[PDB]
Write a protein that binds this ligand. Structure first.
Ligand SMILES: Nc1ncnc2c1ncn2[C@@H]1O[C@H](COP(=O)(O)OP(=O)(O)O)[C@@H](O)[C@H]1O
Ligand SMILES: Nc1ncnc2c1ncn2[C@@H]1O[C@H](COP(=O)(O)OP(=O)(O)O)[C@@H](O)[C@H]1O
Ligand SMILES: [Mg+2]
Lengths: 345, 347
C-alpha cells in the first residue's frame, strides 16, 4: 500500500474550488491501495493536517479543514501518518501566494516528491510574457503582441503607443503579465481606452502584455507525461458565441485536431513541463490556430475539462490520478539518480 | 533598528565558499543598524539558527554551528530574535535539491522578504536553454548554438549531428542545461568527442545545449536594483588559459564598455531579475560581443567580482549590503501593496 498527501486550500478565494477538487480526488482514490493524509492551507496561510482518509467524503462538514493538527512546515511534511515517507504529494491549490512555482520550491527544498510541474515550468506559465517568448521560440503561432515594464512606459509612452497602433489592430487587450484568471484585463478599442487600461493595469502589476484581439472558439488539450508525453483529442466549451457544457471531441476537422494535439505536445516541451499541462488555443472561423496559454495546474474536478478529456481516451479519473502519482515517483527518482550520479564524479 | 537573517551553507560543492561568504557579510554589516541572526544549513538539511550576532568573527570555523534553535524551518524564518518578522533574509547558499529558485519559493510561502532574485528569475538563469531563449527574444548577441532533450536525441541522433556540422564550427562546447557551474561540460574538437560528450552529459541531465567555442575575453558587469536598475563598468577575469584574478576596470575601449553596460541592463530585464545580477560576456580581440550567461547569485566574497565592480563605482561592501536589503524591502512592500489593491476592487 502507498502513501499520498493532498495539499489544498490556499490564501485565494479560489479556495472553494480547491475544496471541491480535494473532495473529488479523495473519493476517486482506492483506499485499499493508498494511505492518504491531507493538508489544508487557510486563507490566513496556516497548515492543517488531517490523517488517514478511509471513508468516502459526502460533504464539507466531514473535512476538518482549519481544525486539523496545526502543522509546522518542516521535515515532517515528508512523513506520512502510516510512519512512512510520502510516495507522492498532490498540490491542488492553483497559483498560490507570491506565484505558482513557490510551493514546488518548498517541496524541492524538503525533498518531497510531488505531482505536476516543477519550479521553472509552473513559474514560467504564471508569467504571460515569458510563456509567450518560449512558444514563439518553439515556433508556435500566437496572436500579435507587445509587452513592456512600467519603467519602460514611464519613459517611452509615445513610442509604445505608436508601436501598438502600428503593429496592432484595435481592439487590443491589456493584460498584467503575472496574475492569473483576474484583474487589470481590459478591452480597448482605441488609444484613449488603451491608455487608461494600461493605467488601470499598472495599479496591480509591473509588467504588461498588450494583445491583439480575435473572435475565436476556445479549444483545449490535456497532456500527460514526463519525458514521453501524450496528448488528448481536443474539446471545447459548448456555445454559439465567444462574445458547465463541454464538447469532447471538439467539433472540428480531423486534421485541425491532429495539429492541435501536436501543438500541445510542443507547448508542453516549450515550458519543460512535468506530469501534466492543459494547452488552450483560439481557433477562428477559417481554422486559424493560435496558442493562448498553457496551464500548469488546471481544473481537476470530476467534471473539469482536463479530467473529461482523458476520459475520452479511456483513462478514467481514478486511473488518471494513479498515473499522475507514478509520474511523480518516476520524476523524484530520476532526480535522485542524477543528484547521486553527479555527486560521485 | 532592523532585523536581518543570513542563511548560508547548503548541501553543495560550494558549501565552504558559502561559509566564507557568511563571514565576509557578517563582518561588513553595521551591527549599529541591524540585529542579525544566522541560519546554518549543512550538507544534511540540518538547519541551525544562532541569534543576535554582535561580534567580529575571526575564523571561518566559528560558522560551523554545533546546534540550532530547536524549532522547525517555519518558526526559524517567520520570527527574528527580536520577536517581529524579518525586514530581510539574505540567502548566501545556492538552494540544493532541484537547485536555484527553490529556497526563494520557500520564502514566498512563509511570506518572508528576501534579498536577490525571485523564483522565476533564479530558475531561468539556471536553465541555460531558457535563459538563451530570453536573451534571443530581447535582441542580445549569442554564439551559435543548438539545444535538445534526451528523447529528441534518442529519436534523431543523426539529424542533430548533421545540424551541429551544418550550423556550428568545431570545437563546440557540450553543456548540460540544468546543472550549475559544474561538470558534464566539455569542449569537443570532432564528432567522436561530441558523441561522448552528449553521453557524459546525459547521465546528469535530460536536456543539453551545444555551443560554438570562441576565443574571447571573459568580461563581467554587475547590476543592482529592482525596477530602475544600474550597471557597473565591466571588469575582466584575467587568465592566460581558460579550461582569483580580476582587472577592474577592464582594458576595453570606451564605446565597448558603454555597449556592455547597456547590454547588462537588457539581460537583467530579459530574465526579470530583482536585486542583482552579474552578466557574463565574451569579447573577441576584434571587439565582438556575446552574452554567455547571467548569474542570479554570484560570488559575494569581499574579493569577488560582483562586490569589487561596485567598489569601483564608489559603493563599498558595507553599503552594497545595505542596499541589497533595502531593495529586498521595497520589493516585498511593493508585492504586498499590489495584493491589497487587487483585493480591493469588486466589479
Ligand atoms: N486576444 C484575445 N482575443 C479574444 N479574447 C481574449 C483575448 N485575450 C483574452 N481574451 C479573453 O479573456 C479571457 C482571459 O484571458 P486569458 O489569456 O485566458 O487569461 P487568464 O485565463 O489567465 O485570465 C479569455 O478566456 C478570453 O476569452
Ligand atoms: N563557447 C565557449 N567558448 C569558449 N569558452 C567557453 C565556452 N563556453 C564556456 N566556456 C568556458 O567554460 C567556463 C564555464 O562555463 P559557463 O558557460 O560560464 O557556465 P558555468 O559557469 O555555469 O559552468 C567559462 O568560464 C568559460 O570561460
Ligand atoms: Mg560561468
Amino acid at each position: 500500500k502507498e502513501n499520498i498527501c493532498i495539499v489544498f486550500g490556499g490564501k485565494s478565494a479560489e479556495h472553494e474550488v480547491s475544496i471541491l477538487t480535494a473532495q473529488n480526488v479523495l473519493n476517486a482514490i482506492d483506499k485499499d491501495k493508498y494511505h492518504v493524509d491531507i493538508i489544508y492551507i487557510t486563507n490566513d496561510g496556516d497548515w492543517r493536517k488531517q490523517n488517514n482518509i478511509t471513508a468516502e467524503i459526502k460533504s464539507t462538514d466531514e473535512l476538518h479543514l482549519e481544525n486539523g493538527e496545526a502543522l509546522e512546515i518542516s521535515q515532517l511534511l515528508k512523513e506520512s501518518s502510516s510512519g512512512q515517507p510520502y510516495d507522492a504529494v498532490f498540490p491542488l491549490l492553483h497559483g498560490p501566494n507570491g506565484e505558482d512555482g513557490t510551493i514546488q520550491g518548498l517541496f524541492e527544498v524538503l525533498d518531497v516528491p510531488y505531482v505536476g510541474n516543477g519550479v521553472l515550468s509552473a513559474a514560467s506559465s504564471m508569467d504571460k510574457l515569458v510563456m509567450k517568448q518560449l512558444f514563439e521560440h518553439r515556433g508556435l503561432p500566437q496572436l500579435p503582441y507587445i509587452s513592456f515594464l512600467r519603467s519602460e512606459y514611464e519613459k517611452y509612452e509615445h513610442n509604445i503607443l505608436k508601436l501598438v497602433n502600428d503593429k496592432l489592430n484595435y481592439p487590443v487587450f491589456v493584460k498584467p503579465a503575472n496574475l492569473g484568471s483576474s484583474v487589470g484585463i481590459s478591452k480597448c478599442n482605441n488609444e484613449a481606452e488603451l491608455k487608461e487600461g494600461i493605467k488601470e493595469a499598472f495599479q496591480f502589476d509591473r509588467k504588461l502584455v498588450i494583445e491583439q484581439g480575435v473572435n475565436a472558439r476556445e479549444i483545449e488539450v490535456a497532456v500527460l507525461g514526463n519525458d514521453y508525453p501524450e496528448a488528448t483529442w481536443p474539446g471545447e466549451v459548448v456555445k454559439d458565441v465567444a462574445f458547465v457544457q463541454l464538447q469532447i471531441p471538439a467539433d472540428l476537422d480531423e486534421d485541425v485536431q491532429l495539429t492541435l494535439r501536436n501543438m500541445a505536445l510542443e507547448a508542453f516541451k516549450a515550458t519543460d513541463c512535468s506530469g501534466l499541462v492543459r494547452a488552450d488555443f483560439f481557433v477562428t472561423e477559417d481554422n486559424q490556430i493560435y496558442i493562448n496559454e498553457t496551464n500548469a495546474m488546471p481544473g481537476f474536478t470530476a467534471f473539469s475539462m482536463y479530467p473529461k478529456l482523458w476520459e475520452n481516451m479511456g483513462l478514467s479519473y481514478p486511473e488518471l490520478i494513479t498515473k499522475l502519482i507514478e509520474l511523480a515517483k518516476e520524476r523524484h527518482q530520476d532526480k535522485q539518480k542524477n543528484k547521486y550520479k553527479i555527486d560521485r564524479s
